[model samples]
Target: NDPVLLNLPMNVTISENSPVSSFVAHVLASDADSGCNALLTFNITAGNRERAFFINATTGIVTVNRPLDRERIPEYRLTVSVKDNPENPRIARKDFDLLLVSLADENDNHPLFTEGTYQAEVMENSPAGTPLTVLNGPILALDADEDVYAVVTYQLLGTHSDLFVIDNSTGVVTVRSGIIIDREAFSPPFLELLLLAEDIGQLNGTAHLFITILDD
Candidate 1:
């Protein structure tokens, strides 16, 4: 009995969603035939423009020499037929798995929201549209959508009407109406308000963007 022909380790591990910049394929092959000296032949005419993959005949390993775009070919159907001399080519084995190639991510658009916090000060006498400093920062968030076609909408949370308005596009904060900056006749003066940022990605989700109006 020959241990050389006993069994060869076989495997194919490719990174999921690898971008088009570059990619590689790793193949590990072995034989289980009783006892036979073997040579390997690889076929990838259907891959990489029929030249998309390369293999060392003696090593029986396949490698991707060029880049692949999964958007163009999300998955590939490749049939690898292994032949070992003429003795066991009939007994040889072949296998395949889904190879994923991904496109690089680009940040073209982002949501605008009050940063850490937005604050403004007035002498208990301020009018709407009063300039308040909205912290310049990205409103961190997560999307639960299963696809890339998710839609995101914005809103100001907990902000009272006829008093504050926010630019959904620029994340700018402005006073919509005049304010006393003091306790309400009943509530008192110098109040801090809570603003909200809501979205509709997969469902109705929201985050609180905090703000404060002070009496200086």
Candidate 2:
């Protein structure tokens, strides 16, 4: 049936496990006419398309150009076709199993800071609410598990809550209300903290952040 009556659905469905930047497909095919000589190739599918479909004509694989955010797109459907020796009649109409798989994002990102260490100095007479540390950096992260698994927390270490107070979301460490900076004023006294960034899937995750105290 080289003069194929393409009978596949004009569209197939896929969930935006995340979402998409663009949607496009080469709509390629292979047949017995040329002995599958025309190995249909597909790769990049972008503009002039929908919200989450990318089809390449050179590799036949779909990928996400932009990180998928399910919040933006919860459902997506794509259409694909083939163009092989359409003039040949020896080969029957070939149909491919419309692959409709979710394009998942990466959970490799976390609450990132400009620097790994936070440094601050306290004056001899500094009082509580004294802003000694400021993350001043981005506190956002991307999770393959999506926002459902993004949880973050901050904890003080080494001392029994005497040196500083850190914000779980802002990454800011402030002076406690009754801490004596006089002992720390003679020299640059310091303390270390362990900030945990978790993804509860809805606000938690499968990992925890840990580090040793540097206060000496």
Candidate 3:
């Protein structure tokens, strides 16, 4: 008679950051015959590219053999087999099972600014709350991670950071309320500010912004 698998075709999920040798799953099988015919052995037969996983020959416990990266390969389908009387191949009866492993994503990437620097121009004596338009377009950042991990927030910094404010959800920069630009009062007729994009993971990316104040 053929070997019977107690738990076959299993599905499991683990974080991509799971450490090597982490326990993945277990397989159990039995045979109807007695003596050596009932003794069982397990082996991973297929779908184990790069040997990323290992299974105990006698215990049938599967474990991670290498590092996992969800961004690269998201899932694995392993073919496992169990044989009764493994020592005597002539009389052994074998059965096969499948193990589906899914890797969950982690926030391992930082938000990246689309541009290293941006430039804008505003007329002197401009009213407070005037939105500044960058020479290229609106400022933006991107995070490679998925779901909530990709959410990004924007902030302004630098010497004249207090004079301007950034939209937290969008990268829009505007003159702070009650603050008007005076081209003649400020030296060099230009203002420099640092823009920071931060992801939910607290990882940050920064860009430079230069504003040229023009005569009214």
Candidate 4:
């Protein structure tokens, strides 16, 4: 047990969605028993998802089995057991819970609406460029992904695009200058416009804004 310390501590940490089949960490174990007990064997007993990891019995080097998602599972507890004999654990067997691997974040999660769809009721004859909604900061979205994709952008789309506008850099929503909200234009006496929020990713996130202009 000289090379294999009896109190060998094992632990590892890695980012989620690592570049497929990456090296994770190493485990250590030794047989305190003598003679036949000198020879050791190892295997993963539990705490593996879809067999996303494997261990080298001789080398004790743990490796990723597939891509991991931090959004799905934040941590992993790999349970490895060692035995000096095959038949009975009374001979010499040990289990280790010392292995703990925590998953770091990645740009995987999409922007989600922590709050419901954005709704606003603005005065029908309000002056142009009126602050309808504080789209700059109040609009809520949560992205489990990294900050690059977590940033949110807002835009006015379709129908009354000319009547309303949003700040390109900021998400502030307001009435467009020179655009008057004529209540009699529609049966409801209120104009409806579409709002879109987006993020940067292969599969980006989107949110809708429903603004209703009411009579003064």
Candidate 5:
């Protein structure tokens, strides 16, 4: 008689933050044959590229073998085989079962800016609500995390932060309302500010912003 696998989960979902040796699942197999043929041994035959999982041959218990990173590898497809007799190869079943293990993302990465610094020029007489066009295109950031963890927001920070306003969602910079930029008033004729991009997980990245004030 062939060994029959019982109570095997076709799909399993675990978090990327799960530690090593964490219990994944227990596999059970039953055989109707007498004596040694009734005894079953479990082994993982395929789809373990990094040996990320371990299965006990006697207990048929599966566990995590190492750390998991959702950004590196999101899922694992494993083939588990069960045999009735270990010493004889002809007594085992020819077919095996497949298990799909999915990894849930964690907030482990920080937002990254596209550029090291941004530069722009605007007239001193520019309107208070005028949008400034950056010389190097739009300022943007990317988060390696998934879903809500990847949602990024923007902010402006510096001694002159009150002079400019930034769109929290879009990173658009504009002169603050009721504020004026005078090229002749400031000695340097330029403003230095910091642009910060942050994700929902509070992980953040920063870039330098240099704005040259031109005479109208």
Candidate 6:
């Protein structure tokens, strides 16, 4: 190999959130000259984020300097070069997307609800286990998380959660068992409840629910 010749097409992929101070990739260069000249020095000229990585000058081993947030910047393009001598010597430079950092999803964001409270009205003589309204349908939520973490599930949160059940898969709420809605039992003849929405990220959100029983 010529003293100025370096390896070609060095491509590597680093998964996001790798352990700090861990090995990433290595760049190697060789010189035909003997002894001291054969010893090469490596340096990264570009694509660094607050010095997120470090490379061994003698060994060309690149290591992580700190934690990486790939969600912020999914990939990095580094330009590494090697030289036969430190000053005024034959140099080999390669400019390419040397480091391709691929980010893996993390459970970061929690589920979010649009309405702080939902209101519904049901006839007092309505049948048990029936949907109050034909349009009383699937509630929607947003999970700011990624992938499976974005999946939201619904549940009724109250001591009388059994009075109304929510479809975990559909997020639709329906009366579980109907009874004479006693206006005397509650001041407003309305049922107050908390609706829970959770994500695979193990984070949850809640909304206030008000259901009024009307005399038909």
Best-matching candidate per TM-score? 5
lDDT tens digits, residue span 106-174, model 3: 999888888898988878776777888689778999988867888999999888778788899998988
Q: What is the lDDT of candidate 3?
A: 0.86
lDDT of 4 by residue, 47-100 (tens): 886888888887777788887887777787777766665566565545555567
lDDT of each: 0.44, 0.45, 0.86, 0.66, 0.85, 0.67
Q: What tens digits encode model 5's per-residue C-alpha lDDT throughout 83-111? A: 86656776466337877899998899888
- Candidate 5 — which residues are off by over 4 angstroms? 33-37
TM-score of 3: 0.85
Residue 127, candidate 1: Cα error in Å is 4.0
lDDT of 1: 0.44
Whole-model lDDT for model 5 versus the true structure? 0.85
TM-score of each: 0.38, 0.44, 0.85, 0.64, 0.92, 0.67
Model 6 regions more than 4 Å off: 1-16, 32-37, 49-51, 89-97, 115-123, 126-138, 177-185
Alpha-carbon error at 145 in model 5, in Å?
Answer: 0.3
Greater lDDT among 2 and 5 belongs to 5
Each candidate: RMSD to true structure? Answer: 11.9, 10.0, 2.6, 5.0, 2.0, 4.6
lDDT of 5 at 89: 75
Higher-TM-score candidate among 2 and 6? 6
lDDT tens per residue, model 2, 30-54: 4555454554433322231343455
Top candidate when judged by lDDT against the true structure: 3
2 against 4, candidate with superior lDDT: 4
Ranked candidates, highest lDDT first: 3, 5, 6, 4, 2, 1
